[PDB]
Amino acid sequence: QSTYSRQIKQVEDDIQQLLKKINELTGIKESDTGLAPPALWDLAADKQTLQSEQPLQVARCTKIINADSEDPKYIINVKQFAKFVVDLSDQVAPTDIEEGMRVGVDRNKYQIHIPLPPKIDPTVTMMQVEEKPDVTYSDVGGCKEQIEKLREVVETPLLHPERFVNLGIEPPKGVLLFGPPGTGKTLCARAVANRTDACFIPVIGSELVQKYVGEGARMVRELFEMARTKKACLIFFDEIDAIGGARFDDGAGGDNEVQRTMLELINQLDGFDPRGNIKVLMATNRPDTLDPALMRPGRLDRKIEFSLPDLEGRTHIFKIHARSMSVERDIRFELLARLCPNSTGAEIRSVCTEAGMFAIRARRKIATEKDFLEAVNKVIKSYAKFSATPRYMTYN
Amino acid sequence: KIKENSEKIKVNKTLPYLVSNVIELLDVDPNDQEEDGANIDLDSQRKGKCAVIKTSTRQTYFLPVIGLVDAEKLKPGDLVGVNKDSYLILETLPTEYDSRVKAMEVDERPTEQYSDIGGLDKQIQELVEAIVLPMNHKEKFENLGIQ
Amino acid sequence: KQYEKSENDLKALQSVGQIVGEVLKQLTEEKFIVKATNGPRYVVGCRRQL
């Protein structure tokens, strides 16, 4: 026991001294080797080392014009923006490299070994992405009227296109979710996403805006296309007043950088092509910034307003939230909600959160009446004045 | 014999090779430019068909152009290859668009058929007349005499 | 024609490809200082023939 205790202190020095031997064998620092997958890969790996496949320099192929001296040549423009005419390394056919497609070329010997995967140039957009999140279903208010309306458009073609063709109905496209902050445009979208069980990419537009004008635009088209190719994709575009703002200039400023990207999104949704069956959802912070192209049916078939959750909604959010929580059940959860003024969805929940905290604070296996009264009287006075909604709603 | 003389050039001729563009096309004699006087009254300018080349690394290289595809074909805007290991013209390539432009080219859209796209009858006539007819039904337009 | 390529190309390989320059300033007409369009400035000679 006493012997065992001594080792706790010791192990830290012991790992530090040993550290050059650990580094070589397991990984990180001096001589990075994992030993488990690069070992297995080693025989294949030898082929690449021998060749000039290292380097294999980032590029995209402009045109595959072949010409004389060395016959299989391709005209490539690198991502840093200068063109090279290159050769084919025998390991693929001239068929594999195709005009407009992303391709790898060497820097020491300019020639294609293996073509580089096309359109995955944004890393910034990927940063935000978590596939299938949600706080928990209980905070939503569960099934609201708001959730059910959203499923008819959203869930149903992804889950079954079969039923769509059978009846003979065109498949939907766009749902525009709007309301001031905290009416839960994102919360409901996450809930339907999980249910349908389509792969889920949500992204903030604020990372599809980067560097100067036109670089952000390249990111939006390539991302969108990639999703479109993919069968049963759901894209929830989170908070766009960052690729979704007003269209003007006054020639003392200009909205341009924002409008280049916004317009690039709008164009792509249905396309100049019929439509796909892959769904787009847009969440906007203003209904006051939208231009008519976005609004046309077949890029936006029905407008759903998630603004200030409905008369039914205010009570469901408290009771379904209350259900989950250890709380008193001699108080009417609806009475607390009803008290709440012109409540944004975020605000109804704010009562539950504040109410529960007092209950946790005591460390009881329920809650008491007192915790609820202080919470609710506080919420009605202060919070409501200080919500998003008074300022935004008049504007909108 | 051609391969043998070419042999010193041939090592540089292979990979890597850059691409470049033609600042000027210089059409002169096939081999040996004029001779200058002074001490030794003989050549210093031996330039055959030649091109003054600006590379796209923002460097400028002078080189006598290959007798297989001469300077004369070459003009400003044309792509031409040039070898990195020693700046000779690897090849001649024709002028071509960016990758973005390749996306821009045809994709084609399918028919909604005139009858089948509901109403707006007066408008079917306006678009058909303006757009598709001058291209396809071109002879009637030539007969009208309009541009 | 191919034999022709080899000979005209031969002239360049002596230099290891010729480089464009322009007289940055005339100091004498025998030794000039030249600025290179590929980049750095040089002090260069001239031919006894030119």
Coordinates of C-alpha atoms in Angstrom, one line a residue:
Chain A
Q1 CA 0.0 0.0 0.0
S2 CA 2.7 2.3 1.2
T3 CA 5.0 0.9 -1.6
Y4 CA 2.2 1.5 -4.1
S5 CA 1.8 5.1 -3.0
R6 CA 5.5 5.8 -3.7
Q7 CA 5.0 4.8 -7.3
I8 CA 2.3 7.6 -7.9
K9 CA 4.8 10.3 -7.4
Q10 CA 7.5 8.4 -9.2
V11 CA 5.8 7.5 -12.5
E12 CA 5.9 11.1 -13.7
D13 CA 9.8 11.4 -13.5
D14 CA 10.1 7.8 -14.9
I15 CA 8.0 8.7 -18.0
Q16 CA 10.1 11.9 -18.5
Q17 CA 13.5 10.2 -18.4
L18 CA 12.3 7.4 -20.7
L19 CA 10.8 10.0 -23.0
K20 CA 13.3 9.6 -26.1
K21 CA 12.6 5.8 -26.0
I22 CA 8.8 6.3 -25.7
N23 CA 8.8 8.9 -28.6
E24 CA 10.4 6.6 -31.1
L25 CA 8.3 3.5 -30.3
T26 CA 4.6 4.8 -29.6
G27 CA 4.6 8.3 -31.2
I28 CA 4.9 12.1 -30.9
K29 CA 8.1 14.1 -30.5
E30 CA 11.5 12.5 -31.8
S31 CA 10.9 9.9 -34.4
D32 CA 7.0 9.9 -34.7
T33 CA 5.9 6.4 -35.6
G34 CA 2.7 4.9 -34.4
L35 CA 3.8 1.2 -34.8
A36 CA 0.2 0.0 -35.2
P37 CA -1.1 1.4 -38.5
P38 CA 2.1 2.8 -40.3
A39 CA 3.7 -0.8 -39.8
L40 CA 0.9 -2.4 -41.6
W41 CA 0.9 0.2 -44.4
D42 CA 4.7 -0.2 -44.8
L43 CA 4.9 -2.5 -47.8
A44 CA 2.5 -0.2 -49.9
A45 CA 4.3 2.8 -48.6
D46 CA 7.7 1.8 -50.1
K47 CA 6.1 2.3 -53.6
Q48 CA 5.4 6.0 -52.9
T49 CA 8.8 6.8 -51.3
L50 CA 10.8 5.4 -54.3
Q51 CA 8.7 7.4 -56.8
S52 CA 8.5 11.3 -57.0
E53 CA 4.9 10.8 -55.6
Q54 CA 6.4 12.8 -52.7
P55 CA 6.0 15.8 -53.5
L56 CA 2.5 15.6 -55.0
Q57 CA 1.8 19.4 -54.8
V58 CA -1.9 20.8 -54.6
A59 CA -3.5 21.5 -57.9
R60 CA -6.7 21.5 -60.0
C61 CA -6.6 20.6 -63.7
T62 CA -7.7 23.3 -66.1
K63 CA -7.7 21.3 -69.3
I64 CA -6.2 18.0 -70.2
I65 CA -4.7 19.1 -73.6
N66 CA -2.1 16.4 -74.5
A67 CA 0.9 17.4 -76.7
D68 CA 4.2 16.1 -78.1
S69 CA 7.7 15.7 -76.6
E70 CA 6.3 13.6 -73.7
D71 CA 2.9 12.6 -75.0
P72 CA 0.6 12.4 -71.9
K73 CA 0.4 16.0 -70.5
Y74 CA -2.3 18.0 -68.7
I75 CA -2.5 21.8 -68.2
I76 CA -2.9 22.4 -64.5
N77 CA -3.3 25.6 -62.4
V78 CA -2.1 25.2 -58.7
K79 CA -4.3 26.5 -55.8
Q80 CA -1.6 29.3 -55.2
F81 CA -2.4 30.3 -58.9
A82 CA 0.2 29.6 -61.5
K83 CA 0.0 27.0 -64.3
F84 CA 2.5 24.2 -65.1
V85 CA 2.3 21.7 -68.0
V86 CA 3.0 18.3 -66.5
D87 CA 3.4 14.7 -67.4
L88 CA 1.7 11.3 -66.6
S89 CA 3.4 9.0 -64.3
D90 CA 2.4 5.4 -65.1
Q91 CA 0.1 4.3 -62.5
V92 CA -3.0 5.7 -64.0
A93 CA -4.4 6.2 -67.4
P94 CA -5.1 9.7 -69.0
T95 CA -8.8 8.8 -68.4
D96 CA -8.5 9.2 -64.6
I97 CA -7.4 13.0 -64.8
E98 CA -10.5 14.9 -66.3
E99 CA -10.9 18.7 -67.1
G100 CA -12.0 20.7 -64.0
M101 CA -11.2 17.8 -61.7
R102 CA -8.7 18.1 -58.8
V103 CA -5.3 16.5 -59.5
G104 CA -1.9 15.9 -57.8
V105 CA 1.4 16.8 -59.5
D106 CA 4.9 16.7 -58.2
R107 CA 7.1 19.7 -57.5
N108 CA 10.4 18.1 -58.4
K109 CA 9.2 16.3 -61.4
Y110 CA 5.7 17.6 -62.3
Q111 CA 3.6 14.5 -63.1
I112 CA 0.4 12.7 -61.9
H113 CA 0.5 9.6 -59.9
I114 CA -3.0 9.7 -58.3
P115 CA -5.7 12.4 -58.8
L116 CA -6.5 14.4 -55.7
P117 CA -10.2 14.1 -54.3
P118 CA -12.2 17.0 -55.8
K119 CA -14.0 19.7 -53.9
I120 CA -12.9 19.5 -50.3
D121 CA -11.0 22.8 -50.2
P122 CA -12.9 24.5 -47.2
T123 CA -11.3 23.3 -43.8
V124 CA -12.8 26.5 -42.1
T125 CA -16.4 25.4 -42.6
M126 CA -15.6 21.9 -41.3
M127 CA -14.3 23.4 -38.0
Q128 CA -17.8 24.1 -36.7
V129 CA -19.4 20.9 -37.9
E130 CA -20.8 18.3 -35.5
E131 CA -22.9 15.7 -37.2
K132 CA -26.3 15.0 -35.4
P133 CA -26.1 17.2 -32.2
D134 CA -28.9 18.2 -29.9
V135 CA -29.0 19.4 -26.2
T136 CA -31.6 16.8 -25.3
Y137 CA -35.2 16.3 -26.8
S138 CA -36.8 17.3 -23.4
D139 CA -35.9 21.1 -23.6
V140 CA -37.6 21.4 -27.0
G141 CA -41.1 20.9 -25.6
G142 CA -41.0 17.6 -27.4
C143 CA -43.7 17.5 -30.1
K144 CA -44.9 21.0 -30.6
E145 CA -47.1 22.2 -33.4
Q146 CA -44.0 23.8 -34.8
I147 CA -42.0 20.5 -34.9
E148 CA -44.8 18.6 -36.8
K149 CA -45.1 21.2 -39.6
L150 CA -41.4 21.0 -40.1
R151 CA -41.3 17.2 -40.5
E152 CA -43.8 17.0 -43.5
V153 CA -41.4 19.0 -45.7
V154 CA -38.1 17.9 -44.2
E155 CA -38.2 14.2 -43.0
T156 CA -40.4 12.7 -45.5
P157 CA -38.5 12.8 -48.9
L158 CA -35.1 11.9 -47.4
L159 CA -36.6 8.9 -45.7
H160 CA -38.6 7.7 -48.7
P161 CA -38.5 9.3 -52.2
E162 CA -40.6 6.2 -53.2
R163 CA -43.8 7.5 -51.7
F164 CA -43.2 10.9 -53.6
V165 CA -42.9 9.4 -57.1
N166 CA -45.9 7.0 -56.3
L167 CA -48.4 9.8 -55.5
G168 CA -46.8 11.9 -58.2
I169 CA -46.1 15.0 -56.1
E170 CA -43.1 17.2 -56.9
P171 CA -40.6 16.9 -54.1
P172 CA -40.3 20.1 -51.8
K173 CA -37.1 22.3 -51.6
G174 CA -36.8 25.1 -49.1
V175 CA -38.0 25.8 -45.6
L176 CA -37.2 29.4 -44.3
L177 CA -36.9 29.5 -40.6
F178 CA -37.2 33.0 -39.0
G179 CA -37.6 34.9 -35.8
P180 CA -35.3 37.0 -33.6
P181 CA -32.6 35.2 -31.5
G182 CA -33.8 32.4 -29.2
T183 CA -37.0 31.3 -30.8
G184 CA -35.1 28.1 -31.6
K185 CA -34.7 27.9 -35.4
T186 CA -31.6 25.7 -34.8
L187 CA -33.1 23.6 -31.9
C188 CA -36.0 22.3 -34.0
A189 CA -33.8 21.6 -37.1
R190 CA -31.5 19.5 -35.0
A191 CA -34.5 17.5 -33.7
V192 CA -35.9 16.7 -37.1
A193 CA -32.3 15.9 -38.4
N194 CA -31.9 13.1 -35.8
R195 CA -35.3 11.7 -36.5
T196 CA -34.9 11.4 -40.3
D197 CA -31.5 10.0 -39.7
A198 CA -30.0 11.6 -42.9
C199 CA -26.3 12.7 -42.6
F200 CA -26.3 16.1 -41.1
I201 CA -23.9 19.0 -41.9
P202 CA -24.8 22.2 -40.1
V203 CA -22.5 25.1 -40.9
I204 CA -22.2 28.8 -39.9
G205 CA -21.9 31.1 -43.0
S206 CA -19.4 33.3 -41.0
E207 CA -16.6 30.7 -41.8
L208 CA -17.8 30.5 -45.6
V209 CA -16.8 34.2 -45.5
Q210 CA -13.0 34.4 -45.2
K211 CA -10.1 36.4 -46.8
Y212 CA -11.3 38.7 -49.6
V213 CA -14.3 38.8 -52.0
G214 CA -14.6 35.6 -54.1
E215 CA -12.7 33.1 -51.9
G216 CA -15.6 32.7 -49.6
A217 CA -17.8 32.2 -52.7
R218 CA -15.7 29.3 -54.0
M219 CA -16.2 27.6 -50.6
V220 CA -20.1 27.9 -50.7
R221 CA -20.4 26.4 -54.3
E222 CA -18.1 23.5 -53.7
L223 CA -19.7 22.6 -50.4
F224 CA -23.2 22.8 -51.7
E225 CA -22.5 20.6 -54.7
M226 CA -20.8 18.1 -52.7
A227 CA -23.8 17.7 -50.5
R228 CA -26.2 17.7 -53.5
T229 CA -24.2 14.7 -55.0
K230 CA -24.6 12.9 -51.7
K231 CA -28.0 10.9 -51.5
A232 CA -30.1 11.7 -48.5
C233 CA -28.3 14.9 -47.2
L234 CA -29.9 17.4 -44.9
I235 CA -28.1 20.8 -44.7
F236 CA -29.2 23.2 -41.9
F237 CA -27.6 26.6 -42.7
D238 CA -27.2 28.1 -39.2
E239 CA -27.7 31.9 -38.6
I240 CA -27.2 33.7 -42.0
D241 CA -26.9 37.4 -41.8
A242 CA -23.3 36.6 -42.7
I243 CA -24.4 35.2 -46.3
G244 CA -27.9 36.4 -46.1
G245 CA -27.7 40.2 -45.4
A246 CA -29.2 43.2 -47.4
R247 CA -28.3 44.0 -51.0
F248 CA -27.1 47.4 -51.7
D249 CA -24.2 49.8 -52.0
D250 CA -24.2 53.4 -51.5
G251 CA -20.6 54.0 -52.7
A252 CA -19.3 54.8 -49.1
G253 CA -19.1 51.2 -48.1
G254 CA -20.8 48.3 -49.7
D255 CA -22.4 45.0 -48.8
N256 CA -20.6 43.2 -51.7
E257 CA -18.5 40.7 -50.0
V258 CA -21.6 39.5 -48.2
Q259 CA -23.9 39.6 -51.3
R260 CA -21.4 37.6 -53.5
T261 CA -21.7 34.7 -51.1
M262 CA -25.4 35.1 -50.4
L263 CA -26.3 35.1 -54.1
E264 CA -24.0 32.0 -54.6
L265 CA -26.0 30.1 -51.9
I266 CA -29.4 31.1 -53.4
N267 CA -28.5 30.2 -56.9
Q268 CA -27.4 26.7 -55.9
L269 CA -30.5 25.5 -53.9
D270 CA -32.8 24.4 -56.7
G271 CA -30.4 25.3 -59.4
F272 CA -31.1 26.2 -63.1
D273 CA -31.7 22.3 -63.0
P274 CA -35.2 20.9 -62.1
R275 CA -34.4 20.1 -58.4
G276 CA -32.9 17.3 -56.5
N277 CA -34.5 15.6 -53.4
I278 CA -31.7 16.8 -51.1
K279 CA -33.1 19.3 -48.6
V280 CA -32.0 22.8 -47.7
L281 CA -33.0 24.6 -44.6
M282 CA -32.0 28.3 -44.1
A283 CA -32.1 30.0 -40.7
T284 CA -32.1 33.9 -41.0
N285 CA -32.0 36.4 -38.3
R286 CA -34.2 39.0 -40.1
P287 CA -37.1 38.6 -42.5
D288 CA -36.2 42.1 -43.6
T289 CA -33.0 41.4 -45.5
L290 CA -34.3 38.8 -48.0
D291 CA -34.3 39.4 -51.8
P292 CA -37.2 37.8 -54.0
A293 CA -35.0 35.0 -55.7
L294 CA -34.7 33.2 -52.3
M295 CA -38.4 33.6 -51.8
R296 CA -39.6 31.9 -55.1
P297 CA -41.5 28.5 -54.5
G298 CA -39.1 25.7 -55.5
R299 CA -36.4 27.4 -53.6
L300 CA -38.8 28.2 -50.8
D301 CA -42.2 26.4 -51.0
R302 CA -43.8 27.4 -47.6
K303 CA -42.5 30.0 -45.2
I304 CA -42.6 28.7 -41.6
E305 CA -42.3 31.3 -38.8
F306 CA -40.8 29.9 -35.6
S307 CA -40.9 33.4 -34.1
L308 CA -42.2 33.7 -30.5
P309 CA -43.4 30.1 -30.0
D310 CA -47.2 29.8 -30.2
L311 CA -49.9 29.6 -27.5
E312 CA -49.6 25.8 -27.3
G313 CA -45.8 25.9 -27.5
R314 CA -45.2 28.1 -24.4
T315 CA -46.9 25.5 -22.1
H316 CA -45.4 22.4 -23.9
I317 CA -41.8 23.8 -23.4
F318 CA -42.3 24.1 -19.7
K319 CA -44.0 20.8 -19.1
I320 CA -41.8 18.6 -21.3
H321 CA -38.8 20.4 -19.7
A322 CA -40.3 20.0 -16.2
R323 CA -40.9 16.2 -16.9
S324 CA -37.2 15.5 -17.3
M325 CA -36.3 17.7 -14.2
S326 CA -36.8 16.8 -10.5
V327 CA -39.4 19.2 -9.6
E328 CA -42.6 19.8 -7.5
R329 CA -45.8 18.6 -9.1
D330 CA -48.3 20.6 -7.1
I331 CA -47.4 23.7 -9.2
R332 CA -49.0 24.2 -12.7
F333 CA -46.1 24.4 -15.2
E334 CA -48.4 26.2 -17.6
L335 CA -49.1 29.0 -15.0
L336 CA -45.4 29.8 -14.9
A337 CA -45.2 29.9 -18.7
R338 CA -48.4 31.9 -19.0
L339 CA -46.9 34.4 -16.6
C340 CA -43.9 34.8 -19.1
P341 CA -44.5 37.9 -21.4
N342 CA -44.6 37.4 -25.2
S343 CA -42.2 34.7 -24.7
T344 CA -39.4 33.7 -26.9
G345 CA -38.6 30.1 -26.6
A346 CA -35.3 30.7 -24.9
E347 CA -37.1 32.9 -22.3
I348 CA -39.6 30.0 -21.3
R349 CA -36.8 27.7 -20.8
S350 CA -35.0 30.4 -18.7
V351 CA -37.6 30.1 -16.0
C352 CA -37.1 26.3 -15.8
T353 CA -33.4 26.7 -15.7
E354 CA -33.5 29.3 -12.9
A355 CA -36.1 27.3 -11.0
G356 CA -34.1 24.1 -11.1
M357 CA -30.9 25.8 -10.1
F358 CA -32.5 26.8 -6.7
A359 CA -33.6 23.2 -6.3
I360 CA -30.1 21.8 -7.1
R361 CA -28.7 24.4 -4.7
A362 CA -30.6 22.8 -1.8
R363 CA -29.9 19.4 -3.1
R364 CA -33.5 18.1 -2.9
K365 CA -34.9 15.2 -5.0
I366 CA -37.7 17.6 -6.2
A367 CA -38.1 21.4 -5.9
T368 CA -40.2 23.6 -3.8
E369 CA -42.8 26.4 -4.5
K370 CA -40.4 29.1 -3.3
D371 CA -37.8 28.4 -6.1
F372 CA -40.5 28.7 -8.7
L373 CA -41.9 32.0 -7.4
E374 CA -38.6 33.9 -7.2
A375 CA -37.7 32.6 -10.6
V376 CA -40.9 33.5 -12.4
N377 CA -41.4 37.0 -10.8
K378 CA -37.8 37.8 -11.8
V379 CA -38.3 36.6 -15.4
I380 CA -41.5 38.6 -16.0
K381 CA -40.0 42.0 -14.9
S382 CA -36.5 42.0 -16.1
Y383 CA -35.8 39.4 -18.8
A384 CA -38.7 40.1 -21.1
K385 CA -37.8 43.8 -21.5
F386 CA -34.2 42.6 -22.1
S387 CA -35.1 39.9 -24.6
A388 CA -34.2 40.0 -28.2
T389 CA -37.8 40.3 -29.3
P390 CA -39.0 44.0 -28.4
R391 CA -36.3 45.6 -30.5
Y392 CA -36.2 43.1 -33.3
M393 CA -40.0 42.5 -33.8
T394 CA -41.0 46.2 -34.6
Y395 CA -38.1 46.3 -37.2
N396 CA -39.2 43.1 -38.8
Chain B
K1 CA 22.0 11.5 -85.5
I2 CA 19.2 13.9 -84.5
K3 CA 18.8 12.1 -81.3
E4 CA 22.6 12.1 -80.6
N5 CA 23.0 15.9 -81.2
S6 CA 19.8 16.5 -79.3
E7 CA 21.1 14.4 -76.6
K8 CA 22.5 17.3 -74.3
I9 CA 19.2 19.2 -74.7
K10 CA 17.2 15.9 -74.1
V11 CA 18.3 15.5 -70.5
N12 CA 16.9 19.0 -69.6
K13 CA 13.9 18.4 -72.0
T14 CA 12.4 15.8 -69.7
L15 CA 10.7 16.5 -66.4
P16 CA 10.4 19.0 -64.7
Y17 CA 9.2 21.5 -67.3
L18 CA 7.3 24.8 -66.6
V19 CA 4.8 26.6 -68.9
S20 CA 5.1 30.2 -70.2
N21 CA 3.6 32.7 -72.6
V22 CA 4.9 34.6 -75.5
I23 CA 5.8 38.3 -75.0
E24 CA 6.8 38.6 -78.7
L25 CA 7.1 36.4 -81.8
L26 CA 10.3 37.0 -83.6
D27 CA 10.4 35.9 -87.2
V28 CA 13.9 36.3 -88.6
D29 CA 16.2 33.8 -90.5
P30 CA 16.1 30.0 -89.6
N31 CA 19.6 29.9 -88.3
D32 CA 22.3 32.5 -87.5
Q33 CA 21.4 36.1 -87.0
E34 CA 23.6 39.0 -88.4
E35 CA 27.3 39.6 -87.8
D36 CA 28.7 42.6 -85.9
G37 CA 32.1 44.2 -86.8
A38 CA 34.9 45.5 -84.4
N39 CA 37.7 43.1 -83.4
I40 CA 36.8 39.8 -85.1
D41 CA 34.2 41.0 -87.6
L42 CA 31.8 38.1 -87.1
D43 CA 28.7 36.9 -85.2
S44 CA 27.6 37.4 -81.6
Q45 CA 23.8 37.3 -82.5
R46 CA 23.2 33.7 -83.7
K47 CA 19.4 33.7 -83.0
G48 CA 17.3 31.5 -85.3
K49 CA 13.5 31.5 -85.0
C50 CA 13.3 32.8 -81.5
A51 CA 10.7 33.9 -78.9
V52 CA 11.2 36.3 -76.0
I53 CA 9.5 34.4 -73.3
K54 CA 8.0 35.6 -69.9
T55 CA 7.5 32.8 -67.6
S56 CA 4.7 32.7 -65.1
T57 CA 7.1 32.6 -62.1
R58 CA 7.6 36.3 -62.9
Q59 CA 11.0 35.7 -64.4
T60 CA 12.0 36.4 -68.1
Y61 CA 14.1 34.1 -70.2
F62 CA 15.4 34.5 -73.7
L63 CA 15.5 31.4 -75.8
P64 CA 15.9 30.4 -79.5
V65 CA 12.7 28.6 -80.5
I66 CA 12.5 25.1 -81.9
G67 CA 12.6 24.6 -85.7
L68 CA 9.7 22.0 -85.4
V69 CA 7.1 24.6 -84.3
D70 CA 8.3 27.9 -85.2
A71 CA 8.0 31.4 -83.8
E72 CA 5.6 32.4 -86.6
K73 CA 2.7 30.1 -85.4
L74 CA 3.2 31.5 -81.8
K75 CA 1.6 34.7 -80.8
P76 CA 0.7 36.6 -77.7
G77 CA -1.6 34.7 -75.4
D78 CA -0.4 31.4 -76.6
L79 CA 0.9 28.8 -74.0
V80 CA 4.2 27.2 -74.7
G81 CA 6.1 24.8 -72.6
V82 CA 9.7 25.5 -71.3
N83 CA 12.1 23.3 -69.5
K84 CA 13.2 24.2 -65.9
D85 CA 16.5 22.5 -66.1
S86 CA 17.6 24.8 -68.9
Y87 CA 15.2 27.1 -70.7
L88 CA 14.5 25.7 -74.1
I89 CA 11.0 25.5 -75.5
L90 CA 9.7 22.0 -74.5
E91 CA 6.5 22.3 -76.7
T92 CA 3.9 24.5 -78.2
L93 CA 0.3 24.2 -76.7
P94 CA -2.9 26.0 -77.9
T95 CA -4.7 28.8 -75.8
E96 CA -7.2 27.5 -73.2
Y97 CA -9.6 28.6 -70.4
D98 CA -9.3 28.5 -66.5
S99 CA -10.8 25.6 -64.5
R100 CA -13.8 27.8 -63.3
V101 CA -14.7 28.4 -66.9
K102 CA -14.9 24.6 -67.5
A103 CA -17.8 24.5 -65.1
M104 CA -19.5 27.4 -67.0
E105 CA -19.7 25.3 -70.2
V106 CA -22.8 23.2 -71.2
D107 CA -24.8 21.1 -68.9
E108 CA -28.1 21.1 -70.7
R109 CA -31.6 21.4 -69.2
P110 CA -34.6 19.1 -70.1
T111 CA -38.0 20.0 -71.7
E112 CA -41.0 21.5 -70.0
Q113 CA -42.7 21.5 -73.5
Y114 CA -44.6 24.6 -74.6
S115 CA -48.0 23.1 -74.0
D116 CA -47.1 21.5 -70.8
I117 CA -45.7 24.8 -69.2
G118 CA -49.0 26.2 -68.0
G119 CA -50.4 29.5 -69.2
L120 CA -48.5 32.7 -70.1
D121 CA -49.3 32.1 -73.8
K122 CA -48.4 35.6 -75.2
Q123 CA -44.9 35.2 -73.4
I124 CA -44.2 31.6 -75.0
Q125 CA -44.2 33.5 -78.2
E126 CA -42.0 36.3 -77.0
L127 CA -39.2 34.1 -75.6
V128 CA -39.3 31.5 -78.5
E129 CA -39.0 34.3 -81.1
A130 CA -36.2 36.1 -79.5
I131 CA -34.0 33.4 -78.3
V132 CA -34.2 30.0 -80.0
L133 CA -35.4 31.1 -83.5
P134 CA -32.4 33.3 -84.6
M135 CA -30.1 30.3 -83.8
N136 CA -32.0 27.3 -85.1
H137 CA -34.6 28.8 -87.6
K138 CA -31.7 31.2 -88.7
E139 CA -32.6 31.3 -92.4
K140 CA -35.9 33.1 -91.8
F141 CA -34.0 35.8 -90.0
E142 CA -31.6 36.2 -92.8
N143 CA -34.6 36.6 -95.1
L144 CA -36.0 39.4 -92.7
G145 CA -32.7 41.2 -92.9
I146 CA -32.3 41.9 -89.1
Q147 CA -29.4 41.5 -87.0
Chain C
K1 CA 13.3 20.0 -88.8
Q2 CA 14.0 18.0 -85.7
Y3 CA 17.8 18.2 -86.5
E4 CA 17.1 22.1 -86.6
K5 CA 15.6 22.1 -83.1
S6 CA 18.8 20.5 -81.7
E7 CA 21.1 23.0 -83.2
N8 CA 19.2 26.3 -82.3
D9 CA 18.7 24.8 -78.7
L10 CA 22.4 24.1 -78.6
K11 CA 23.2 27.8 -78.5
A12 CA 21.0 28.3 -75.4
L13 CA 22.4 25.4 -73.5
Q14 CA 25.9 27.0 -73.5
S15 CA 24.5 29.8 -71.3
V16 CA 22.2 27.3 -69.5
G17 CA 19.4 29.2 -71.1
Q18 CA 19.8 32.9 -71.9
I19 CA 18.1 35.5 -69.6
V20 CA 16.4 38.8 -70.6
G21 CA 17.9 41.9 -69.1
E22 CA 18.0 45.6 -69.8
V23 CA 20.7 48.1 -69.3
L24 CA 19.9 49.6 -65.9
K25 CA 22.5 52.3 -66.7
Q26 CA 25.4 52.8 -69.1
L27 CA 28.7 53.2 -67.0
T28 CA 30.9 52.4 -70.1
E29 CA 30.2 50.6 -73.4
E30 CA 32.1 47.5 -72.5
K31 CA 31.0 46.9 -69.0
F32 CA 27.4 47.7 -68.4
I33 CA 25.3 47.3 -65.4
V34 CA 22.2 45.4 -66.2
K35 CA 19.0 44.8 -64.2
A36 CA 17.4 41.4 -64.8
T37 CA 13.8 40.9 -65.4
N38 CA 14.2 37.5 -63.7
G39 CA 15.4 39.4 -60.8
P40 CA 18.9 40.6 -59.5
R41 CA 21.2 43.3 -60.9
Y42 CA 24.7 42.3 -62.3
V43 CA 27.8 44.1 -63.7
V44 CA 28.2 42.3 -67.1
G45 CA 30.7 42.5 -70.0
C46 CA 30.1 42.9 -73.8
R47 CA 31.6 41.1 -76.8
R48 CA 34.8 42.2 -78.5
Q49 CA 32.6 41.7 -81.7
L50 CA 29.2 43.3 -80.8

